[PDB]
Amino acid sequence: PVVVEAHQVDTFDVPGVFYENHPHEPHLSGMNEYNQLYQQSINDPDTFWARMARDLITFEKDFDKTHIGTLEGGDNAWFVGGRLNASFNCVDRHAMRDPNKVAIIYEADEPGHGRSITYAELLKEVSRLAWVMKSQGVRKGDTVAIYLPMIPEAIFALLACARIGAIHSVVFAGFSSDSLRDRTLDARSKFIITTDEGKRGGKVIGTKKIVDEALKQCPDVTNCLVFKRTGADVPWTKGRDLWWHEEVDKYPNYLPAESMDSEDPLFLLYTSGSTGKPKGVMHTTAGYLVGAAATGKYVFDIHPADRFFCGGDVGWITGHTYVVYAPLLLGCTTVVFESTPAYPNFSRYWDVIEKHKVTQFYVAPTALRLLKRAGDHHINHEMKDLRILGSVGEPIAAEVWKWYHEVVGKRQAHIVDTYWQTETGSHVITPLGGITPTKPGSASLPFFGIDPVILDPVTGAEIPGNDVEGILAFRKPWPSMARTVWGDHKRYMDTYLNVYKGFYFTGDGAGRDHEGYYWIRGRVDDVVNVSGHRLSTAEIEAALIEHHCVAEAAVVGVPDPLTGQAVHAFVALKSGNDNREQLQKELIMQVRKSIGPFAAPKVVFVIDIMRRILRKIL
Amino acid sequence: PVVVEAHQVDTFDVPGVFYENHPHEPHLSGMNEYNQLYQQSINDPDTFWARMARDLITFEKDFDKTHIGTLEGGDNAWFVGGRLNASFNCVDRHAMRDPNKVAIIYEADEPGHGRSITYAELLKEVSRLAWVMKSQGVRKGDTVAIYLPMIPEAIFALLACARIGAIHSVVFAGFSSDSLRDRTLDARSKFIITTDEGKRGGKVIGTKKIVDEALKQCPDVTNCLVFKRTGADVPWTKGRDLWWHEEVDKYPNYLPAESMDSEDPLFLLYTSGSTGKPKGVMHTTAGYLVGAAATGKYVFDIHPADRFFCGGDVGWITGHTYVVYAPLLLGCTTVVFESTPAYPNFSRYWDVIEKHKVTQFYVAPTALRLLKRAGDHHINHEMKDLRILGSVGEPIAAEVWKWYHEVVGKRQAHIVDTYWQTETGSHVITPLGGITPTKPGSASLPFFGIDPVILDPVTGAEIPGNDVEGILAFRKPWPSMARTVWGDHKRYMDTYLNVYKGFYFTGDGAGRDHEGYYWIRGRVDDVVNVSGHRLSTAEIEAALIEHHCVAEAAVVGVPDPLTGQAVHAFVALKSGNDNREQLQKELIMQVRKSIGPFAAPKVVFVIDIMRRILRKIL
Amino acid sequence: PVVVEAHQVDTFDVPGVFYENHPHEPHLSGMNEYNQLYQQSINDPDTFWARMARDLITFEKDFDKTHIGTLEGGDNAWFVGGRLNASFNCVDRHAMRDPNKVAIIYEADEPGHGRSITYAELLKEVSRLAWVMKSQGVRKGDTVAIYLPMIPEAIFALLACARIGAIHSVVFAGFSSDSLRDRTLDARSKFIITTDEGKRGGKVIGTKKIVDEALKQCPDVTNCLVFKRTGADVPWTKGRDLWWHEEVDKYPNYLPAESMDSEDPLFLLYTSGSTGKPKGVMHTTAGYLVGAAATGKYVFDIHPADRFFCGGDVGWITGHTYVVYAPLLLGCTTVVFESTPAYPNFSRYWDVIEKHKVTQFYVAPTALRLLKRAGDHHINHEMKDLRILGSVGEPIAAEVWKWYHEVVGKRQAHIVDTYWQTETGSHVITPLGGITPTKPGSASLPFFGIDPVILDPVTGAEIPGNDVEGILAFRKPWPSMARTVWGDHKRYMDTYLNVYKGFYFTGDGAGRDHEGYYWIRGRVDDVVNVSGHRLSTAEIEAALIEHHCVAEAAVVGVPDPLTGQAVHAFVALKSGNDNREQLQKELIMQVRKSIGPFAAPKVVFVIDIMRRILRKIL
Numbered sequence A, B, C: 001p002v003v004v005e006a007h008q009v010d011t012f013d014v015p016g017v018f019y020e021n022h023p024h025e026p027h028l029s030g031m032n033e034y035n036q037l038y039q040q041s042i043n044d045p046d047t048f049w050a051r052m053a054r055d056l057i058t059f060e061k062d063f064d065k066t067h068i069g070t071l072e073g074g075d076n077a078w079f080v081g082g083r084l085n086a087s088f089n090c091v092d093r094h095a096m097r098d099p100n101k102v103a104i105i106y107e108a109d110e111p112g113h114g115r116s117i118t119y120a121e122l123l124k125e126v127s128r129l130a131w132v133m134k135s136q137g138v139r140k141g142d143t144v145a146i147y148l149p150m151i152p153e154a155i156f157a158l159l160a161c162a163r164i165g166a167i168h169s170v171v172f173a174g175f176s177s178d179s180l181r182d183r184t185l186d187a188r189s190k191f192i193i194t195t196d197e198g199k200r201g202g203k204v205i206g207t208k209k210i211v212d213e214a215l216k217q218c219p220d221v222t223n224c225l226v227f228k229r230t231g232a233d234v235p236w237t238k239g240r241d242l243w244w245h246e247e248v249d250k251y252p253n254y255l256p257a258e259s260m261d262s263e264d265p266l267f268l269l270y271t272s273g274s275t276g277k278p279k280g281v282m283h284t285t286a287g288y289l290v291g292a293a294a295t296g297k298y299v300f301d302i303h304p305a306d307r308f309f310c311g312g313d314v315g316w317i318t319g320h321t322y323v324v325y326a327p328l329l330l331g332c333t334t335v336v337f338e339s340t341p342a343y344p345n346f347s348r349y350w351d352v353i354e355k356h357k358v359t360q361f362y363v364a365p366t367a368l369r370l371l372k373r374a375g376d377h378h379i380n381h382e383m384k385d386l387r388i389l390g391s392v393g394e395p396i397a398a399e400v401w402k403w404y405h406e407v408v409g410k411r412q413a414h415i416v417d418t419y420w421q422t423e424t425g426s427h428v429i430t431p432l433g434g435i436t437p438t439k440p441g442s443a444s445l446p447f448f449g450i451d452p453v454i455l456d457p458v459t460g461a462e463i464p465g466n467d468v469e470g471i472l473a474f475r476k477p478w479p480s481m482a483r484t485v486w487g488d489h490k491r492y493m494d495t496y497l498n499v500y501k502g503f504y505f506t507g508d509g510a511g512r513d514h515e516g517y518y519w520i521r522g523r524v525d526d527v528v529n530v531s532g533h534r535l536s537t538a539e540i541e542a543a544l545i546e547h548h549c550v551a552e553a554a555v556v557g558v559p560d561p562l563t564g565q566a567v568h569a570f571v572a573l574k575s576g577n578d579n580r581e582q583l584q585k586e587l588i589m590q591v592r593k594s595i596g597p598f599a600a601p602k603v604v605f606v607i608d609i610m611r612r613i614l615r616k617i618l
């Protein structure tokens, strides 16, 4: 077979007990209704997406046309003429119906220190935070930098920005001051929100000190709102720094929501690409929210009473779409988890799921492999309500898919392996929870409105039928597609739309097996996955070259048992240094300074570009 | 009886001739329809207030929900999702139907020098004044300071601010430069509107000189628009000062109205509270306007052809709600009266009512007592159309209520004693004109949507049934409730909502008599009424202490025959001064400087805190 | 007869072949339906204009009233309460229906160097140009100076301004730096759009150098966007100047349209008046667009498939209304012509019409007379589709009307002589294409909603009936009337509305003949037409006086064979100069400097005000 990974892989049905124990009526009746709805979404997207949008999203003003533009034109607009507000759809409309329903479960770094937050409380906090920004001069269309750990205040900040029509720009709280500066400068943000310190896995993160250093080079930032998470003494810049708790107490507990166009920008998410510095992937409002709600509902089988737990950081797209937007759009409860899967111990994920009766859990294989190595004795939890088990970021290997299905899910949960990207906004190739039969290691079948094609890598020609392999592209636009790269539409066109004209280029290889099931082969460009984080080899090379002793740098990606991919770094020293053992500590800190601890090199090879020869030798 | 003021007080029916001579059909059929509508407004406010609002107010976009939030939450919002504009509802919609109908009757300080202004003329003047502010950089959400006497230009200025979505902040034209400065700074206004001079009772008020001094300490004010009321030579600050007549002539006579949220702020009104400096009571848009229209209609029996005359200054809430918003909302004529009840003589109020055929008149008992002492020979006026006689600010005593009913109203008008506060936006306890039987000295029965309870002052417990006395609180929110204290929501919560959790605290004592009629006992806090003006004893104490010779100051309130309450001031001199007769003039001017002439002390006792011992001794 | 120009002038019917060859069904059935619709537009304009507007314009929010205000009040507003966007109506709604339909045919200065632009391409270019302005801080209500030749980018710039609600202020690309400065200062524009150079008739126009000089005195202009039309080396001001092609490549190909009030300003067009410096005639949005569409449809018989060619520059109102707004509103194709009727040769107009199959052509008699003198051998073109021949700016004389009807139109096209002004927005007295019988030299009959009256010049009294002569005024407002003179509503009132109270004063004399046909006599004030350009004699006098040797200047207007009117200039030298031959070159350049080449004097008479004696002597 051409797709060797599919050979003698049989599809597993959804387990019978999933339906027996399900608290509600499923959203689809079976694979027949998926196929019927899928074909309509491909053949008449105007009708299909108009209905999906009006089912799932409340518009202030109804839209006049589902979609205009084309892929090649790079001019796609969805639900044109509509007006709406994302915080209204995530908060107000649920507070209006059921103010005391729990919207957020905060699980703090220490067990036993969280709280639950109702939709009415969430409306209060979003409103008065929005008042703070408005009072300090933030206006519709301005960007706002967010540098926050996984606390509910992070949700408050995204949705407060949405409420006034500011464009939130979330920077992962593990980035260095250089990376924070770069993203804040490029977004031209004048307001930043952060914490005094972070606590994660019992370790203190000096967030405020990192922001202070970054802001020395961001002279357009005139206010910095600091949430007091630890109460530790931090440096304070009078006239610029403001205390979150002092400012929100000044302002009312309700604020009107700003009326936004369907195509006004909602957020920027800086993302590492094959070349160049990180790019600000821009999502607009209606189409992104329709994608988030539609996948939350049909992929994760989300019902209003559900308790949804995504393990990803708000600093990445998984956190954006599935910790925040999708569950709140659908009016269920979402879990904001501040700790690690290993603190206080390796049971922590399951401690959380059991205590809060989580119904769907969503994580990366990197965390599963780490926990699997830790040993099954850490998992002795009923978790009666857990019926969907999500996986994202890389393919979930056979032994991991089995361990996840059997030891975690008790053969009682549906494993949903979701393929997508920052640029797609939401799931694009994925089984639908409780509906689609699955194969270990396969992302299965396209989501509604996603028309995948397999392309010859060199000729760019379509390769028809089943049992084919090549480049993964989509033939048609879809509502939650990224709309531009901030400040650089030409880069957006060249990266995504001009490679294979008429198609959207994912950067990924893929096979489609005999049954039409998709198998993702990973990046055909210089993007690699390092312990759940999307990184550019070019980025790390630029960091290594920043050292005064390095002349030529080369970073390649090779498979690893635990991290998935193991980025390695070669360095050609300019002349010579007799302190090779010492130079290692200095190159390692250079990547720590340029990018962050999480991208620090495993080792720096000192030895005096055909990167493929390096990846094969390693 | 527990409510001793009610003992052997019989209810007086509406006089028969009120109905015989009424020009129209009344709004209610009787007390039965009041009771029916009142119970629905208490038991199903969502339905009741939705209908009332859609009856009385024209929305650009209909609202989606009548009310969200609670009293204890301090998050009340009314008619959420609606959009509207207050100047559209006060002007445009009446100009569109009947452009030549008279909206404003200006009665100037000199008799025979006013004019009448149609709804179309009012639309012109509001529009081009709004153009001036827009052209000078005023934007939606900015505050605008107004320091104007009772001339029609004051109405132009409030409604022009409303038209662009600026937040007008009216400062009584009798305040000192210190008080004007304080209110302008706290509101952070960048634009101010005033007159060259005021004329009232034949006396010149140097408004421009007072603004000039205040603006020396308001460096954010970049334009000051001066209406030429007297033409007197006033100081002029080139580059900042602008002539109203020169600027409006530049701009068109129509301007679009800005689309406002139901809960966008409409105005701030600085108000003296029990503690601290005056606070900016903030009203938003839809709920305030619904309250204003609903009381104008049902309390004052306002019909479109009516000529409505409120005697209160636009600088206070009575002027805001009943000189400006309520009558114009309902499309009748309102009288803007520039003089005093004593100039040229004590007949002046009745001269005005007779000449303009006023149908409803609304005044404070302080003015009635002053006129009553002047003698009945000043009142020899037919006033055929006068059918409603309103009283506000303190309880209308027995002898005054009789004199008002018999000598002024010819036993032909309904005396409507309206209890309310700046914070309630509009009447909350009041008879309804032509409907409710009244008792002298009683405010009678709650308005629609007002659920009064009597609370034990110390235990805060509800006291059920009739013939009870205690603290006056409301059990439920109502549309025109103040939404915050500007810049200090915590003070709003602590003052109004955290004293008796679940209730709104009025600051007033009250009895509910055997028939369920309410009798207002006055402020249980340190707020007193001085000749129609709400004042804080703390404020006057802070003024007296501003003198370099005063160490400890104490101001208390005791009843007075004419002013109602007689605030008195004790002073403990720091060491000693042998110029006691001279120090009196210097302390008196200090209060004149800090607050204004109207709050100047009756006498300052020089003699070296248990304020109750002082109030009892006096 | 009183109207001597009408004596023995018979009406010519529309030629029969017009109907035989017409590609579609006409908009009116005949003169009977015109009369029926005309009487309704005069007798019930509220009903008539409500239907016309809703036929022709797509509103975001429907309007609540057709018209408020009066002529004498100077407060006219049309379609109040409506919301819409002009670029949506010129672009989006046609791109949504038929993205590949050709919107613009660009005919470049060199034949064979144009291109065709579809509605979808136009939506792209308008959107990303709007992004540039938004990114550089342009906001709704700001004015934007445009100094562009006849290239499609000029349409992009008007409609991008409309898209964000900026107010475009187009300056004819032949104006001098002084005139550009004056218009940019008075409009207080902070952004300007121009070209590096213009090419017209094979001659280079140094647009950038002219802007650079003007901007030295416009210190509020902080960005200048330069389109690279020639690629010639031009001076560059780093930090202010931006390249159009570099900036648009950064931004998305779609941008939401800003929601505008019916009465928000759409544009300013500076216009020479009888007295004073040029005035910024301001048009608002809904009424102007309704007038443009209604005349495009009913006067020019525009159908969606038509190819419409107006010969006027975008720098004047004919270009505004009929190169840009009317054809694009109606969704047909418009021709943007960059050259002159004489380059490369005198066939050029017909070369263009034949190659692009133009259906309607619209030009000034000044161009016709110039071509007629050139000789009929330059016209040997089929032009099968040419069915409407438009004339504007002055009366089309008998011999020219015949030459236009016979040699150009092959007796196959309807000659439509359209009378109107910058201030009327669109045609007001005109035959309707294919409907109205015409007389050579007459503008025939009023357009819908135009109620012309003939007034006695001195007594200002109406002169009833037919065969009368006098001043031309309109009795009623109409939707596309100019709404103010920018910054000077008083001048607007005094110029147009206070001369003859209750009427609109056109500045023109006119006769109404025995059949009720109108004959325009031209300006009764000091405005003259110089080779298709509206000019003030006062303006040229002020220019001549700017010379240090001129004391008193006098400019008068007399008829001319080719230019129509021949403005001449007399000068009284201050003392004396023995270089009279040299002084001529210096006075001629002074007018070239103050106004522009196109207003330079024919000759300056040096000889040491009763202007009528000068006009008669010449």
Ligand SMILES: CCOP(=O)(O)OC[C@H]1O[C@@H](n2cnc3c(N)ncnc32)[C@H](O)[C@@H]1O
Pocket: A271, A316, A317, A318, A391, A392, A393, A394, A395, A396, A417, A418, A419, A420, A421, A422, A423, A443, A506, A507, A508, A520, A522, A523, A529, A533, A534
């Ligand atoms: C959501 C995170 O989006 P990003 O951080 O922008 O990374 C997106 C990139 O990760 C990879 N990827 C994501 N999901 C899967 C999956 N289920 N199976 C295999 N590979 C996957 C892929 O190479 C894609 O192109």
Ligand SMILES: CCOP(=O)(O)OC[C@H]1O[C@@H](n2cnc3c(N)ncnc32)[C@H](O)[C@@H]1O
Pocket: B271, B316, B317, B318, B391, B392, B393, B394, B395, B396, B417, B418, B419, B420, B421, B422, B423, B443, B506, B507, B508, B520, B522, B523, B529, B533, B534
């Ligand atoms: C409208 C002015 O509002 P303010 O200037 O904010 O004062 C409001 C405060 O005046 C008092 N008050 C007002 N009306 C009455 C009344 N009819 N009978 C008795 N007392 C009254 C009361 O103590 C309240 O709390």
Ligand SMILES: CCOP(=O)(O)OC[C@H]1O[C@@H](n2cnc3c(N)ncnc32)[C@H](O)[C@@H]1O
Pocket: C271, C316, C317, C318, C391, C392, C393, C394, C395, C396, C417, C418, C419, C420, C421, C422, C423, C443, C506, C507, C508, C520, C522, C523, C529, C533, C534
């Ligand atoms: C559209 C250009 O408008 P403007 O450049 O503002 O000039 C408008 C002024 O030109 C004159 N005019 C325009 N059309 C005609 C016509 N068909 N017959 C005679 N005279 C005409 C007239 O004197 C008017 O008052």
